[PDB]
Amino acid sequence: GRQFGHLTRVRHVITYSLSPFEQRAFPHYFSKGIPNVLRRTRACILRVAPPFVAFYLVYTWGTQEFEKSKRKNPA
Amino acid sequence: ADLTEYLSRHYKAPRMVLAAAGGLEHRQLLDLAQKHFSGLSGTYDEDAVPTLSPCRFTGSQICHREDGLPLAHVAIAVEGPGWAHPDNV
C-alpha cells in the first residue's frame, strides 16, 4: 500500500543520472571488477569458510573412521 | 583586467548591431553611426576572432530533491536544432 510521493521526507539531495544510451553497460568490467571481488572475498572469508572446513575435517575423518572400523585384524 | 579583456575580445564592430524602430529615417541612423561608432574596428580586426564550437547535448537527469518546498518544478527537453533550421516553424 506504499506509493512514490508518500514514502518519506528528504531534503537537500541532488542526484545526477545519465541515459542508458549515453553510457556503457560494462564500463570498466575486468579492470575494476576483479579488484572488487577479491576485496569482497577478503571481507567475508573468515566468516564464511571456517565452518565449511570444519564440515570438511569431520567429513574426511568420519568416512575414514567408518571404513577402518569394518575391517578386522587379530581374531 | 578579466573584465577589460572580455570587452576587448568581444565588443568588436562586425559582431554588434545598431538597431532602431520608430519615427526615424534610416539616413540619420546611418549618420549617427558614423558619428559615434566609427572608432571601433578601423584597425582593431585582430587576434583569434572567435569561433563558437558545437555543444554536445546529453540525455540525462538532475534531481534536486527538496521536500520543504510546496510545489515541484520539472523541465524536460529533447535536443532542438539551432536558429538557422527551417524545422523551427
PDB file of C-alpha atoms in Angstrom:
ATOM      1  CA  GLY A   1       0.000   0.000   0.000  1.00  0.00           C
ATOM      2  CA  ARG A   2       3.099   2.282  -0.308  1.00  0.00           C
ATOM      3  CA  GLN A   3       3.401   4.774  -3.227  1.00  0.00           C
ATOM      4  CA  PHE A   4       6.010   7.186  -4.586  1.00  0.00           C
ATOM      5  CA  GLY A   5       5.188  10.679  -3.300  1.00  0.00           C
ATOM      6  CA  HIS A   6       4.086   9.179   0.082  1.00  0.00           C
ATOM      7  CA  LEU A   7       7.166   7.223   1.263  1.00  0.00           C
ATOM      8  CA  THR A   8       9.324   9.565   3.402  1.00  0.00           C
ATOM      9  CA  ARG A   9      10.757  13.138   3.745  1.00  0.00           C
ATOM     10  CA  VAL A  10      14.087  14.019   2.050  1.00  0.00           C
ATOM     11  CA  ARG A  11      15.662  17.492   1.727  1.00  0.00           C
ATOM     12  CA  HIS A  12      18.849  18.905   0.105  1.00  0.00           C
ATOM     13  CA  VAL A  13      19.976  15.888  -2.002  1.00  0.00           C
ATOM     14  CA  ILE A  14      20.933  16.222  -5.697  1.00  0.00           C
ATOM     15  CA  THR A  15      21.058  13.136  -7.984  1.00  0.00           C
ATOM     16  CA  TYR A  16      22.877  13.256 -11.315  1.00  0.00           C
ATOM     17  CA  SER A  17      21.914  10.455 -13.740  1.00  0.00           C
ATOM     18  CA  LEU A  18      22.854   9.560 -17.300  1.00  0.00           C
ATOM     19  CA  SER A  19      20.737   7.956 -20.039  1.00  0.00           C
ATOM     20  CA  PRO A  20      21.426   4.200 -20.744  1.00  0.00           C
ATOM     21  CA  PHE A  21      22.162   5.153 -24.362  1.00  0.00           C
ATOM     22  CA  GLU A  22      24.854   7.667 -23.271  1.00  0.00           C
ATOM     23  CA  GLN A  23      26.850   5.126 -21.243  1.00  0.00           C
ATOM     24  CA  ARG A  24      28.439   1.611 -21.293  1.00  0.00           C
ATOM     25  CA  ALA A  25      26.771  -1.430 -19.747  1.00  0.00           C
ATOM     26  CA  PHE A  26      30.236  -2.850 -18.862  1.00  0.00           C
ATOM     27  CA  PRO A  27      32.118   0.418 -18.060  1.00  0.00           C
ATOM     28  CA  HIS A  28      35.485  -0.981 -16.864  1.00  0.00           C
ATOM     29  CA  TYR A  29      34.383  -4.574 -16.420  1.00  0.00           C
ATOM     30  CA  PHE A  30      37.603  -6.526 -15.673  1.00  0.00           C
ATOM     31  CA  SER A  31      39.908  -3.598 -14.683  1.00  0.00           C
ATOM     32  CA  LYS A  32      37.648  -2.591 -11.729  1.00  0.00           C
ATOM     33  CA  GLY A  33      35.574  -5.793 -11.429  1.00  0.00           C
ATOM     34  CA  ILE A  34      38.314  -8.292 -10.418  1.00  0.00           C
ATOM     35  CA  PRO A  35      39.838  -5.929  -7.668  1.00  0.00           C
ATOM     36  CA  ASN A  36      36.316  -5.689  -6.178  1.00  0.00           C
ATOM     37  CA  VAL A  37      35.533  -9.466  -5.962  1.00  0.00           C
ATOM     38  CA  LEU A  38      38.885 -10.097  -4.242  1.00  0.00           C
ATOM     39  CA  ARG A  39      38.073  -7.221  -1.786  1.00  0.00           C
ATOM     40  CA  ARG A  40      34.571  -8.710  -1.143  1.00  0.00           C
ATOM     41  CA  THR A  41      36.155 -12.201  -0.659  1.00  0.00           C
ATOM     42  CA  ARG A  42      38.821 -10.906   1.856  1.00  0.00           C
ATOM     43  CA  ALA A  43      35.996  -9.115   3.756  1.00  0.00           C
ATOM     44  CA  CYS A  44      33.951 -12.315   4.280  1.00  0.00           C
ATOM     45  CA  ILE A  45      36.314 -15.421   4.104  1.00  0.00           C
ATOM     46  CA  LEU A  46      36.918 -15.531   7.882  1.00  0.00           C
ATOM     47  CA  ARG A  47      33.142 -15.517   8.490  1.00  0.00           C
ATOM     48  CA  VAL A  48      32.038 -17.966   5.734  1.00  0.00           C
ATOM     49  CA  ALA A  49      34.932 -20.506   5.242  1.00  0.00           C
ATOM     50  CA  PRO A  50      35.896 -21.851   8.801  1.00  0.00           C
ATOM     51  CA  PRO A  51      32.527 -23.709   9.447  1.00  0.00           C
ATOM     52  CA  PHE A  52      32.853 -25.411   5.999  1.00  0.00           C
ATOM     53  CA  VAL A  53      36.452 -26.569   6.590  1.00  0.00           C
ATOM     54  CA  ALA A  54      35.115 -27.710   9.992  1.00  0.00           C
ATOM     55  CA  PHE A  55      32.491 -29.690   7.976  1.00  0.00           C
ATOM     56  CA  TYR A  56      35.292 -30.908   5.633  1.00  0.00           C
ATOM     57  CA  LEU A  57      37.503 -32.216   8.515  1.00  0.00           C
ATOM     58  CA  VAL A  58      34.577 -34.063  10.207  1.00  0.00           C
ATOM     59  CA  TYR A  59      33.613 -35.436   6.717  1.00  0.00           C
ATOM     60  CA  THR A  60      37.142 -36.683   5.916  1.00  0.00           C
ATOM     61  CA  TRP A  61      37.668 -38.166   9.425  1.00  0.00           C
ATOM     62  CA  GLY A  62      34.147 -39.700   9.589  1.00  0.00           C
ATOM     63  CA  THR A  63      34.353 -41.501   6.215  1.00  0.00           C
ATOM     64  CA  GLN A  64      37.899 -42.743   7.121  1.00  0.00           C
ATOM     65  CA  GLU A  65      36.848 -43.930  10.618  1.00  0.00           C
ATOM     66  CA  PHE A  66      33.763 -45.787   9.272  1.00  0.00           C
ATOM     67  CA  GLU A  67      35.936 -47.501   6.567  1.00  0.00           C
ATOM     68  CA  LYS A  68      38.603 -48.651   9.086  1.00  0.00           C
ATOM     69  CA  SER A  69      36.008 -49.898  11.642  1.00  0.00           C
ATOM     70  CA  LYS A  70      34.560 -52.550   9.276  1.00  0.00           C
ATOM     71  CA  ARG A  71      37.983 -54.229   8.983  1.00  0.00           C
ATOM     72  CA  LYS A  72      39.397 -56.757  11.480  1.00  0.00           C
ATOM     73  CA  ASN A  73      42.948 -57.924  12.323  1.00  0.00           C
ATOM     74  CA  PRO A  74      43.852 -60.295  15.327  1.00  0.00           C
ATOM     75  CA  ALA A  75      40.940 -62.784  15.964  1.00  0.00           C
TER      76      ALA A  75
ATOM     77  CA  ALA B   1      41.682  43.042 -16.112  1.00  0.00           C
ATOM     78  CA  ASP B   2      39.387  39.978 -16.602  1.00  0.00           C
ATOM     79  CA  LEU B   3      36.581  42.442 -17.472  1.00  0.00           C
ATOM     80  CA  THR B   4      38.528  44.671 -19.924  1.00  0.00           C
ATOM     81  CA  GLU B   5      39.964  41.529 -21.645  1.00  0.00           C
ATOM     82  CA  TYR B   6      36.336  40.332 -22.173  1.00  0.00           C
ATOM     83  CA  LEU B   7      35.430  43.813 -23.531  1.00  0.00           C
ATOM     84  CA  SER B   8      38.494  43.876 -25.831  1.00  0.00           C
ATOM     85  CA  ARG B   9      37.840  40.374 -27.250  1.00  0.00           C
ATOM     86  CA  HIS B  10      34.064  40.587 -27.738  1.00  0.00           C
ATOM     87  CA  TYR B  11      32.784  44.173 -28.182  1.00  0.00           C
ATOM     88  CA  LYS B  12      34.022  44.384 -31.782  1.00  0.00           C
ATOM     89  CA  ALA B  13      32.198  46.069 -34.700  1.00  0.00           C
ATOM     90  CA  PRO B  14      31.428  43.020 -37.037  1.00  0.00           C
ATOM     91  CA  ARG B  15      29.800  41.289 -34.024  1.00  0.00           C
ATOM     92  CA  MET B  16      27.395  44.094 -32.982  1.00  0.00           C
ATOM     93  CA  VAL B  17      24.246  45.734 -34.481  1.00  0.00           C
ATOM     94  CA  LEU B  18      22.772  49.223 -34.064  1.00  0.00           C
ATOM     95  CA  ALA B  19      19.017  48.569 -34.246  1.00  0.00           C
ATOM     96  CA  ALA B  20      16.202  51.147 -34.224  1.00  0.00           C
ATOM     97  CA  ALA B  21      12.397  51.185 -34.580  1.00  0.00           C
ATOM     98  CA  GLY B  22      10.045  54.151 -34.827  1.00  0.00           C
ATOM     99  CA  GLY B  23       9.813  57.736 -36.076  1.00  0.00           C
ATOM    100  CA  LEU B  24      13.193  57.947 -37.794  1.00  0.00           C
ATOM    101  CA  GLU B  25      14.808  57.994 -41.225  1.00  0.00           C
ATOM    102  CA  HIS B  26      17.400  55.255 -41.854  1.00  0.00           C
ATOM    103  CA  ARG B  27      19.730  58.008 -43.254  1.00  0.00           C
ATOM    104  CA  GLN B  28      20.159  59.730 -39.844  1.00  0.00           C
ATOM    105  CA  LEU B  29      20.571  56.382 -38.028  1.00  0.00           C
ATOM    106  CA  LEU B  30      23.405  55.747 -40.547  1.00  0.00           C
ATOM    107  CA  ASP B  31      24.745  59.323 -39.995  1.00  0.00           C
ATOM    108  CA  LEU B  32      24.859  58.927 -36.187  1.00  0.00           C
ATOM    109  CA  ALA B  33      26.505  55.506 -36.585  1.00  0.00           C
ATOM    110  CA  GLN B  34      29.441  57.054 -38.485  1.00  0.00           C
ATOM    111  CA  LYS B  35      29.361  59.979 -35.985  1.00  0.00           C
ATOM    112  CA  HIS B  36      29.715  57.929 -32.773  1.00  0.00           C
ATOM    113  CA  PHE B  37      30.661  54.280 -33.605  1.00  0.00           C
ATOM    114  CA  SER B  38      33.407  54.614 -36.287  1.00  0.00           C
ATOM    115  CA  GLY B  39      36.388  54.352 -33.872  1.00  0.00           C
ATOM    116  CA  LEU B  40      35.674  50.675 -33.077  1.00  0.00           C
ATOM    117  CA  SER B  41      37.316  48.287 -35.621  1.00  0.00           C
ATOM    118  CA  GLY B  42      39.004  50.551 -38.239  1.00  0.00           C
ATOM    119  CA  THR B  43      42.291  48.711 -37.453  1.00  0.00           C
ATOM    120  CA  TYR B  44      41.176  46.534 -34.457  1.00  0.00           C
ATOM    121  CA  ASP B  45      40.452  43.460 -36.693  1.00  0.00           C
ATOM    122  CA  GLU B  46      42.986  41.146 -34.966  1.00  0.00           C
ATOM    123  CA  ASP B  47      43.500  38.031 -32.688  1.00  0.00           C
ATOM    124  CA  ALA B  48      41.524  34.703 -32.716  1.00  0.00           C
ATOM    125  CA  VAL B  49      38.098  36.146 -33.669  1.00  0.00           C
ATOM    126  CA  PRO B  50      36.324  33.945 -32.039  1.00  0.00           C
ATOM    127  CA  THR B  51      34.786  30.562 -33.236  1.00  0.00           C
ATOM    128  CA  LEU B  52      31.961  29.185 -31.072  1.00  0.00           C
ATOM    129  CA  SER B  53      32.176  25.346 -31.473  1.00  0.00           C
ATOM    130  CA  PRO B  54      29.178  22.908 -31.171  1.00  0.00           C
ATOM    131  CA  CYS B  55      27.778  21.943 -27.781  1.00  0.00           C
ATOM    132  CA  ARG B  56      27.243  18.248 -27.074  1.00  0.00           C
ATOM    133  CA  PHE B  57      23.698  17.650 -25.791  1.00  0.00           C
ATOM    134  CA  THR B  58      23.480  14.690 -23.436  1.00  0.00           C
ATOM    135  CA  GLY B  59      20.256  12.991 -22.332  1.00  0.00           C
ATOM    136  CA  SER B  60      20.445  12.884 -18.566  1.00  0.00           C
ATOM    137  CA  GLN B  61      18.781  13.864 -15.288  1.00  0.00           C
ATOM    138  CA  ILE B  62      19.370  16.347 -12.493  1.00  0.00           C
ATOM    139  CA  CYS B  63      17.097  15.922  -9.446  1.00  0.00           C
ATOM    140  CA  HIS B  64      17.333  18.438  -6.618  1.00  0.00           C
ATOM    141  CA  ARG B  65      15.091  16.790  -4.022  1.00  0.00           C
ATOM    142  CA  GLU B  66      13.713  19.415  -1.594  1.00  0.00           C
ATOM    143  CA  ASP B  67      10.507  18.290   0.242  1.00  0.00           C
ATOM    144  CA  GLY B  68      10.457  21.607   2.158  1.00  0.00           C
ATOM    145  CA  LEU B  69       9.237  23.379  -0.999  1.00  0.00           C
ATOM    146  CA  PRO B  70       5.411  23.139  -1.540  1.00  0.00           C
ATOM    147  CA  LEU B  71       5.398  22.583  -5.362  1.00  0.00           C
ATOM    148  CA  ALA B  72       7.521  20.516  -7.771  1.00  0.00           C
ATOM    149  CA  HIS B  73       9.195  22.109 -10.790  1.00  0.00           C
ATOM    150  CA  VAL B  74      10.079  19.801 -13.717  1.00  0.00           C
ATOM    151  CA  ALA B  75      11.542  20.831 -17.103  1.00  0.00           C
ATOM    152  CA  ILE B  76      12.053  18.256 -19.842  1.00  0.00           C
ATOM    153  CA  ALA B  77      13.610  18.738 -23.283  1.00  0.00           C
ATOM    154  CA  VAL B  78      14.955  16.926 -26.301  1.00  0.00           C
ATOM    155  CA  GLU B  79      17.769  18.496 -28.346  1.00  0.00           C
ATOM    156  CA  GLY B  80      16.393  21.090 -30.699  1.00  0.00           C
ATOM    157  CA  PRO B  81      18.129  22.390 -33.835  1.00  0.00           C
ATOM    158  CA  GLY B  82      19.678  25.880 -33.893  1.00  0.00           C
ATOM    159  CA  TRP B  83      18.374  29.308 -35.024  1.00  0.00           C
ATOM    160  CA  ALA B  84      19.044  28.524 -38.724  1.00  0.00           C
ATOM    161  CA  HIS B  85      16.864  25.427 -39.179  1.00  0.00           C
ATOM    162  CA  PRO B  86      13.514  25.558 -41.118  1.00  0.00           C
ATOM    163  CA  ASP B  87      12.251  22.796 -38.693  1.00  0.00           C
ATOM    164  CA  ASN B  88      11.635  25.512 -36.036  1.00  0.00           C
ATOM    165  CA  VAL B  89       8.383  26.695 -37.663  1.00  0.00           C
TER     166      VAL B  89
END
